[PDB]
Amino acid sequence: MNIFEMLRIDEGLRLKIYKDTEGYYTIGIGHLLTKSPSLNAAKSELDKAIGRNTNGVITKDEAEKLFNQDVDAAVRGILRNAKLKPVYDSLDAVRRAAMINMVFQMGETGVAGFTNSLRMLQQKRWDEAAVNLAKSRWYNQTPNRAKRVITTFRTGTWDAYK
Ligand SMILES: [Cl-]
Ligand SMILES: [Cl-]
Numbered sequence: 741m742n743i744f745e746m747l748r749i750d751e752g753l754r755l756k757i758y759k760d761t762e763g764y765y766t767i768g769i770g771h772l773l774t775k776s777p778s779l780n781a782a783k784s785e786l787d788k789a790i791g792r793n794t795n796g797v798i799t800k801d802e803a804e805k806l807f808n809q810d811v812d813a814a815v816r817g818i819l820r821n822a823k824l825k826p827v828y829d830s831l832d833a834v835r836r837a838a839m840i841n842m843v844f845q846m847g848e849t850g851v852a853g854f855t856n857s858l859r860m861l862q863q864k865r866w867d868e869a870a871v872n873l874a875k876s877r878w879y880n881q882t883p884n885r886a887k888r889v890i891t892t893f894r895t896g897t898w899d900a901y902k
Contacts, residue, residue, distance in 0.1 A: 741898040741901055741902070742837070743811060743837045743840050743841070744807070744811065745901075746837055746841060746898075746901055747769065747770065747807075747811065747840075747841060747844060748769060748807075749901055750770075750841065750845075750885050750888065751769050751770030752769070752770075753768065753769055753800075753803060754766075754767065754768065755767075755768070755797060755798055755799070755800065755803060756796060756797050757773065757779070757782055757783070757786065757796045757797075760772070761881065761882055762881075765779065765781075765782035765785075767786060767796075767798060767803070767806075768798065768802070768803035768804075768806045768807060769803055769804075769806070769807040769810075770807075770810075770844065770845070771789075771803075771806045771807070771810060773785045773786055773789070779796075782796075783795070783796055786798070789806065790802055790806075810844060811840070811844065814840050814843045814844045815840060817843060817847075817848040818839065818840065818843055818848065821848050821852060823852045823858065824839075824843075824848065824851065824852055824858075826862065827839065827858050827861055827862050830861075830862050830864075831861070832896055834892060834896050834897060834898060835861070835892065835893055835896055837892070838889050838892040838893050839851070839861075841889055841892075842854075842889060845885075846878065850878075854873070854876070856872050857869050857872045857873045860872060861893065866893065866894050866895075866896075867894065869893060869894075870890050870891075870893060870894040873886075873889075873890050873893065874886070874890060887900070888900040888901060
């Protein structure tokens with residue numbers, strides 16, 4: 741198991757513009773297009789992202805290309821962030837994947853907002869961090885996915901995904 745396979749299980753794959761759990765226009769493997777309500781603003785973002793007139797539909801390769809970019813940006817976002825980097829550096833490889841998953845889903849700003857949990861992760865207080873991570877809108881809104889991520893943090897293994 742790896743970050744790509746992990747995120748592909750959590751996000752799924754859709755070749756047509758769809759709405760995410762929050763109601764925003766997305767495509768591919770969890771690629772957010774726009775928070776705007778306009779499907780046209782979504783089609784426009786999409787064409788801009790792909791470099792062609794898509795009419796809201798993309799190929800598997802196109803989906804994968806967006807996905808490769810998004811994982812790369814997520815890692816680089818972590819490494820550039822003063823609050824995130826120290827945590828990331830302190831973690832083992834499996835747990836690193838869990839933090840990348842949170843950032844891909846909620847952005848660097850969002851994760852950086854989990855101040856107390858980040859501190860507990862840095863100190864390697866697994867059980868306590870897992871408890872604190874659960875007291876969030878994140879867990880409340882997407883509980884099955886949050887549990888998987890959280891279990892990865894708690895255990896340091898890929899069990900939740902197997
Ligand atoms: Cl893009
Ligand atoms: Cl969920």
